[model samples]
Target chain A: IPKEMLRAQTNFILRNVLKQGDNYVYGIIKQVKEASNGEMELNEATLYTIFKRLEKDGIISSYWGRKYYRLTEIGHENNRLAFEGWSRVDKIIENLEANKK
Target chain B: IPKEMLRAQTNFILRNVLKQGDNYVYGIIKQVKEASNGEMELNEATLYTIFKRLEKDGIISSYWGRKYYRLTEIGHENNRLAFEGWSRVDKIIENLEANKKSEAIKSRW
Candidate 1:
């Protein structure tokens, strides 16, 4: 669902991919396809929307070859921020869990 | 601007860090401090909260010596997923921009 926490979750995953490096880009994609296990309802529009935003922000840059796809340095930097943010998110959720227990 | 698009942006940033590698962890932290520019509103409570969640998800793990903080293997994997999601988000935004131009064309109506 479209919630703040879910957004955090999404961001958390993105940082993981960029950290893995170009060599494993395909491996990362494979994991995502595997993790989703085709259970998550992701639309084509959603995919394109993410690419456009990252490109505009200079987080990612793309070129035309056989297929148009790539990430830039700025993209790498942004992913780091997202991961750190996730760290904070993880802590927050735990606090809530602790309180409940 | 804690909006959906903003969330996408945040996720995009997190994935970037994971791609950088373990040695660069300190470098990543420095950049985040720089990027915030001390202008954005953030709190200590928020910080601890994220760390806890990541640990629970097996996305990251920690150990103690002097100060405790570290990421685990799963943390690395999760980061990769986040980056891919950003790729999708970028494309979506582009479509919106194009639609804006398309709408402008219809402004004559």
Candidate 2:
């Protein structure tokens, strides 16, 4: 957590908004609301905190000014990290159920 | 998405606070603060909201005249779910670099 992360979460949301190419915070807000059928909405402060942290972490970078942000190569790698972790989460939890400790 | 209850954060907090046999809101606040070496502090509103919602969901319950709250039977099962998922976190992080190297070579086929 040294200059890093949240569980709204930074990793899970990494794989979400940035895969589309260039993105802005409101686009993220709109998309999540659309995706969740208005059941969920992201607070801009949360996104900015993620933005600030990820920018510092080099997982996100801004262009055309700080207002426009997109995933960096490291961000994509982190995204893959989330997806890869997800693929294994199912595998791991299944094993947990099998072995009772 | 509605397949389960409890937000991920709340569920994670449930695993941390309630695993200690019996716990209370103050006990949870102290445990988190002490465990994190004071790097973290939980807002009462945050924990209270979690406690209220989880209590309604059967994952959290109280006794000793509503003063002590502990994990219900469902709580432990949910902890295992969160715990093992966590175990994979470090290992997957370890795998990230290796997989990155492979991603560049994958299209060579």
Candidate 3:
């Protein structure tokens, strides 16, 4: 996936896992690629990096897992708001595009 | 800069540059660093990477410039709404924190 799309994907996970209560979710890489319609691929390293980023920003924290991940409250809130913002912007854009016809 | 902080910083740019009407603005890297209280630093490549990210995300677009940048309509809306959401969420969190101190005691208690 393009880098920006990756950001959106990451943001999606952040939002869904928190606000939507998909806690303890794992397999982010697989989920992202599948969701992107095969246009995006993510690696373990990249995933870890994003994890670190979210962790540092107080968005998420980590604990021992069987190759899975967990989320913190801060992370939940961050994802929720980010997703909310994305939805609003996306809706506006979609509306404008529709009007372009 | 910390990666997450950079994301916040980048998000801020995506918001202010659009909603705030600082259109056709340049010097984002400098502005971000300054605004971040020097806790963040952005190189040209990282900056461009974020630009590409925002562009791809349909948050911001670009045109010709003298080492500066501009915003697209999609970018404008993206930034505006992102800022709006951030503001709402942030306010909620702040309120929650305040409530912990017995501030604004709700009837539920």
Candidate 4:
């Protein structure tokens, strides 16, 4: 996958998992890899980088104790809106494909 | 939208339009804006940047004279795979939401 694609996929996985509850980095990585059927094998360094980026972007926050990560309110809203946008584009593609056939 | 999300959306639009036929930059912009219901109004600078990136990544090619852009064969395959991957993720999200609802209902029981 491309760098941007991998980032997007990792963010998607991170947000979805965090929505369930706060978890440590390794636990989140384990869940994402399992959920993706091993398609998204994020390295420890990359996972931390994503964590830092998301936190810097105000989409996620980290607590000191146990180093747990969770999405901020803004992060939840951003994820929801982004997912909706992707769904809309996917529908458009489906329509285009259907029309072509 | 974030930069990465915007790039993904623009790439999706570009690949879809190019799959139909070769077209100039402005034409593609017009088609994408129309297709997206005005949500994705990609300016000339951004469009050119995306074109350059795609070309550099071997997903598209540009020709002189008319300045038309067309997808390489690899571009077609990449777009197909990307869309499929997105669809799979969408399905997973949908299933997760459904199960959450079901679990909520069960808890209420």
Candidate 5:
């Protein structure tokens, strides 16, 4: 996957998994790796960088207690749009595959 | 889609379509747009750039007579690998959805 694509995937996954509550970096990394079926293995540094960026962008907020992060309203909306784009591409690929069959 | 992802998608589409024979840029672009359900709209310059990159990378070759292009063997192999990767992600997403459904059911119990 492209770097930007991976970033989008990471953002989407983070927002999705964090919907229930705030989560620390390690837990977020584990969920993302599992969700991608091991296709993506994000180290702590990368996750932290993304978290910082997302927080700076106002997409997510971090609590100092346990360094937990959760999506802001903008984060949720952005994830929805990103996932919609992903679904469109997925559907397009599905259509192409079906045509092949 | 990201630029690299778009490039991968273009590479896959070109290889698949040109399997029969060489194709011109416009035809390939049209086919790609249609295949993408209008989600992707690639212009001629972008297509040409991707074509040149693929050709330079030895994934595709162009003929002089009609300016047509076809995939090389390596292109076919790369497309296969990319598609497999895509399929794995697709399966993962499907599994996640299934798990969510089960979780919802469990919550009611």
Candidate 6:
């Protein structure tokens, strides 16, 4: 997550965190480093828009999100979907790296 | 990727493509589906901003772009660095899944 890359990959962070469960809105300041393994950090202003956007959609609960127990279907399908998507990215990066020139 | 999630993860696409060699942004619109084995399909509208952003950053060469070549050395480095950084998210997610439930709260020391 090269700084903007987290903002670049918000739902991967948000939805994955959203599914981690038993907790909600762990840090409202939305530490980019929190998602990035304390490596590169972002501008620190954008995670708000994403939360509101995810909230606006049913991906997360509207009223319940501030303390929700789960995603919209007791949890949204996007969690699995999001993770699997990036797993492919990881897999492909390995693909390219191994086949690298 | 998920629908909005590709927009969510642009550089992974852009930088990786920038490294993929002799590719002209051609079917990149179509390749993620190929990349994901057709599990994900992102249409044309997505590439416009991505090319615009990366080109403007000089990550993709403006004039030479359509000619097809590798991006600059620094460009590949950014891709590599971004790969590690993005991959870190995998580490966190791996933990939540692997150490999940009842097996939960077992370690933090």
Could you tell me how far off, in angstroms, the CA of residue B74 lies in candidate 3 after the best superposition?
1.3
lDDT of 1 by residue, A1-101 (tens): 22554565454454454454442334444445544554333344555576678678776666554235456776666565655554554453344334335
lDDT of 4 by residue, B34-107 (tens): 66666666678877987888889899888877698888898888878877876777666555556557868999
lDDT of 3: 0.51
What level of docking quality does candidate 4 show? acceptable
lDDT of 5 at A16: 58
Best by lDDT: 4
Per-model lDDT: 0.50, 0.59, 0.51, 0.73, 0.66, 0.57
Least accurate stretch of 10 residues (summed lDDT) in model 3 chain A?
Answer: A17-26
Regions of model 6 farther than 4 Å from truth: A1-4, A27-50, A62-66, A91-101, B8-10, B27-42, B62-66, B95-109
TM-score of predicted chain B, candidate 6: 0.66
Candidates 1 and 3 compared by DockQ, better number:
3
Query: Model 1, B1-109: lDDT tens per residue?
Result: 2234344443344444434433233444454444554333333344445556666777666555433445577776666565455445445434434544575789977
The DockQ-derived docking category for candidate 5 is: acceptable
**Candidate 2 lDDT score at position A64:** 70
Summed backbone clashes in each candidate are: 66, 0, 3, 0, 0, 4
Chain A TM-score of model 6 comes to 0.57
**In candidate 1, which residue ranges exceed 4 Å CA deviation?**
A1-101, B1-31, B106-109
**Docking class of predicted structure 2:** incorrect
Model 5 lDDT per residue over A1-101, tens place: 33433444444455456654678988766666766777777689977887897789887898877598998888776666656655665666566667656
Per residue, candidate 5 scores C-alpha lDDT tens digits across B16-108 of: 666645788877666667778776776678678767777887878888765888878887776566556656656655655666678689999
When summed lDDT is taken over every stretch of 10 residues in candidate 1 chain B, the lowest stretch is B1-10
Residues A2-101 of candidate 3: C-alpha lDDT, one tens digit per residue? 3443354345444453453333434554444444445445567766776777678676766664444556776655555665545544454343334333
Q: Mind giving the per-residue lDDT tens digits that candidate 6 earns over B32-109?
A: 555566655554567667666666676666446354535766666766777675667667556545545435556553
Pairs with backbone N, CA or C atoms under 3 Å apart (clashes), candidate 3: A1-A40, A59-A75, B59-B75
Q: Please write out the lDDT profile of model 2 over residues A1-101, one tens digit for every residue.
A: 11111343334444555765777888777766654445456789978897898799887889775388988887777666555544443443333334323
DockQ, all models? 0.03, 0.05, 0.05, 0.36, 0.29, 0.32
Is 3 or 4 the stronger prediction by DockQ? 4
